């Protein structure tokens, strides 16, 4: 398919978003970030596929950057397709103990360090890491960047182009607005919203998230 | 996945939707139509699985419809995917001679039936079939029903859901635009259209996807 894209969207932070192309629809795409502090780089979820995976390392080794560790936001395979290549390369593969229980039972591959709690934090206080509840699945969590003021929801929020909640299959669509009014009710000062696929947008993001929950629920 | 839905959307005139669910996008659906002449049924594009397949036959039987004969109006598998089935039955399956060589050199099915010509007609004068050039793929054709005024555009036409063209690995995105304004020189008095792909509108589907097609096109 169409390679992985890296572009750079805050100082420090980049987008990395890789490609299907499917017949009967045209390419569908998924987003994840490199976040720096200073030459330490943090992979907030893999690419879709090992091959795209291999290109984003080899992306930040070219431009002198030390990635550090990689951090999964659920199961799914296009937050965790390259989580098998990163540990074979022995660069620190994390998950929330919820998604690693769930990629075991999927038989992939496991992260080699996770967490049972509700906040994370990698690098400085670089990224910190929160579960608000289920949505898009029962595992899903978001990334807060404090110094670009950043959050990257992840596949629980939908972009404005988008008219409903995507996939649903592993979806908890009637606890999924009040997960987002929880990211709400951290009073981030949210200047950018990244979603796990679509366009980056704003605040706004979270708001149309609620309205696109709220009507699937009542329907 | 979820199964089959047939409506009626004009008096003889069935819509049939199929579906495939996919990660990392949700619920992608594929239309065709079942255009009656009394009791006698004609299927434009099958749905795009034979299981599908199986349940748009149960559906005519059932009702106490007579299958007479299938048409695809590309070689793409959700125009086809029920070609087999159809031929087990004895069932006519006919396609262009262009789109009959491209599922030959896919390695699918052939129609039992084809024909190398701009214009063909099924039933009465009930389906008018035409060629107006390369978009979706090289071989798309349309259909045009007299007495309902519907113009079933196929994958060659793209709802106004849509803001791109939507699977371009086959297309002639150069000669699109136009392939599109020689179904409007046809001066067919439009009142529906009904894409292979989301939702039936007005004649306006045309004007918006020769948008697309100029946008994509200097792009
Ligand atoms: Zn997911
Ligand atoms: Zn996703
Ligand atoms: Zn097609
Ligand atoms: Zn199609």
Redesign the interface.
């Known amino acids: 398919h169409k390679p992985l894209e890296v572009i750079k969207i805050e100082d420090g932070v980049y987008l990395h978003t890789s490609f299907?192309?499917?017949?009967?629809?045209?390419l569908?795409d998924?987003n994840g970030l490199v976040v720096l502090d200073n030459n330490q780089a943090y992979i907030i979820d893999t690419p879709?596929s090992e091959e795209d995976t291999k290109l984003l390392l080899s992306w930040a080794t070219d431009r002198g950057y030390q990635v550090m560790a990689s951090i999964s936001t659920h199961s799914?395979?296009?937050r965790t397709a390259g989580i098998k290549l990163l540990n074979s390369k022995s660069i620190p593969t994390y998950t929330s103990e919820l998604t690693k229980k769930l990629l075991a039972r999927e038989g992939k591959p496991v992260p080699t360090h996770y967490f049972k709690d509700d906040e994370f934090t990698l690098g400085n206080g670089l990224i910190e890491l929160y579960y608000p509840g289920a949505g898009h699945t029962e595992d899903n969590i978001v990334a807060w960047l404090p110094k670009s003021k950043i959050l990257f929801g992840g596949c629980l929020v939908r972009s404005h182009?988008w008219?409903?909640?995507?996939?649903?299959?592993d979806a908890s669509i009637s606890s999924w607005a009040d997960s987002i009014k929880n990211i709400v009710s951290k009073k981030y000062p949210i200047q950018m919203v990244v979603p796990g696929?679509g366009k980056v947008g704003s605040s706004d993001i979270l708001d149309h998230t609620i309205d696109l929950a709220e009507s699937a629920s009542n329907k």
């Open positions: 299907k192309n499917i017949e009967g629809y045209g569908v998924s879709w799914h395979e296009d182009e008219e409903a909640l995507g996939y649903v299959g696929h």
